[PDB]
């Protein structure tokens, strides 16, 4: 629900789909890769 913000202070809510997009950005992938493929990543994750 809040990613990593609650470990440094107050828990700050953000939608999870947006949490995943920041995480791809942290590894050098542009954030539209998730937003345009949200269903594919969620379905592939669920099987994995």
């Amino acid at each position: 629900t809040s990613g990593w913000t609650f470990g440094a202070g107050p828990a700050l809510q953000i939608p999870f789909p947006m949490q995943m997009a920041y995480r791809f950005n942290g590894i050098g992938v542009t954030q539209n890769v998730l937003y345009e493929n949200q269903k594919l990543i969620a379905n592939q994750f669920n099987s994995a």
Binding site: P17, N32, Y35, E36, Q38
Partner: peptide, 21 residues
Amino acid sequence: CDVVIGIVNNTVYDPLQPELD
């Protein structure tokens, strides 16, 4: 803007267009 889910409609301001024109 027809593949991302959750898009909202809003105006994006370009600073060049007004001043230039």
